[PDB]
């Protein structure tokens, strides 16, 4: 009974939500996220996972400060009014 | 081939010793000043059972000579020690059972136990139940003592090493048959995960050197060289002789 009766015993999560990415990939016993690598300082990325890099790279979010850097450069980082 | 069972034992994943119900390391009192210039008197408060150990332990209380407090040491109980007995530890201690005299100050034929190898490691030799060390001879110049060990070997150790006079309590245990796989289960359940033992000749050849074949047989000789490597040392390692002698 490795199929249907064994699927009834599944009610204990191995992963919960992660703090940096909100992914539900944070392993409870390992205390590590399997997608972004929290709590390591570097973010988990691999050159074989180029599509995953495309999924989580810069520009897939809000860019709350980086949207204005090109415009401030074009104006020359001016000050005043 | 796979990694065999005795090869897997050294990682210590499930092969660590079960130490939940143990009462502390049974060591001798440290050799500070009193034990090497005079003696010191302590008291046996209780004799208790140690989990996974065949011998009982003794809880001996001394006074700290430098601070107002009490020290509690765990000795291995000698056969004949009772609760409320005064235990004397030191160079000038009188020769009675339970006392912790150094080996330079006991005569020929003395039976001691919990013997230090070097002066100060707080007990190494003859600690299992019913075992003892006999003093075979002295050597004052180049101050050493010869001792007979429980294995029958004769060691030559320092005369400043200490030992508890008498034999370890709880002797004669292995004379009783266990009679039951349940009894062996409860015996090893508090020691470590090394039981039950599957024979390697009953395995598959991926799992052991002895495994495989259309009959259960070893194949090559079971005596293994000392220069063999891990994964090969399964059998009788470096056997000088085999068989039942008559």
């Amino acid at each position: 009974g490795k199929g249907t009766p064994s699927f009834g015993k599944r009610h204990n999560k191995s992963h919960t939500l992660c703090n940096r990415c909100g992914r539900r990939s944070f392993h409870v016993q390992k205390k590590t996220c399997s997608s972004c690598g929290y709590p390591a300082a570097k973010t988990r990325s691999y050159n074989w996972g180029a599509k995953a890099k495309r999924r989580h790279t810069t520009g897939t979010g809000r860019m709350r400060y980086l949207k204005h850097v090109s415009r401030r450069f074009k104006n020359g980082f001016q000050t005043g009014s | 081939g796979r990694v065999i069972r005795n090869q897997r034992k050294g990682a210590g994943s499930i092969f660590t010793s079960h130490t939940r119900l143990r009462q502390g390391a049974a060591k001798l009192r440290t050799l500070d000043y009193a034990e090497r210039h005079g003696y010191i008197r302590g008291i046996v408060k209780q004799i208790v059972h140690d989990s996974g150990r065949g011998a009982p332990l003794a809880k001996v209380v001394f006074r700290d000579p430098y601070k107002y407090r009490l020290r509690e040491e765990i000795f291995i109980a000698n056969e004949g020690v009772h609760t409320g007995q005064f235990i004397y530890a030191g160079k000038k201690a009188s020769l009675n059972v339970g006392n912790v005299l150094p080996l330079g100050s006991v005569p020929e034929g003395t039976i001691v136990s919990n013997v230090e190898e070097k002066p100060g490691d707080r007990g190494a030799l003859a600690r299992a139940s019913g075992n003892y060390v006999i003093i075979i001879g002295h050597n004052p110049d180049e101050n050493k003592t010869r001792v007979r060990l429980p294995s029958g070997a004769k060691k030559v150790i320092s005369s400043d090493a200490r030992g508890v006079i008498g034999v370890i309590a709880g002797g004669g245990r292995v004379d009783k048959p266990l009679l039951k796989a349940g009894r062996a289960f409860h015996k090893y359940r508090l020691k470590r995960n090394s039981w039950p033992k599957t024979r390697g000749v009953a395995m598959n050849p991926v799992d052991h050197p002895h495994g495989g074949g259309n009959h259960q047989h070893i194949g090559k000789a079971s005596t293994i060289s000392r220069g063999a490597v891990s994964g090969q040392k399964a059998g009788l390692i470096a056997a000088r002789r085999t068989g039942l002698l008559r």
């Binding site: - | 010869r146 004769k154 060691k155 030559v156 000088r240």
Partner: protein, 49 residues
């Protein structure tokens, strides 16, 4: 090379144990048979004469 090993592992030993261990290891029979082979080496010359 042999003398290093005796200093390494047989320094603390007495002659009763030494005789017991060489009798249990069977080298004493080899020494006996080597001296015996010397004895028939002399003895065959004596029988020839």
């Amino acid at each position: 090379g042999k003398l290093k090993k005796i200093q390494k592992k047989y320094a603390d030993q007495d002659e009763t144990e030494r005789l017991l261990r060489l009798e249990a290891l069977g080298t004493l029979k080899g020494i006996e048979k080597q001296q015996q082979r010397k004895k028939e080496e002399i003895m065959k010359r004596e029988v020839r004469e």
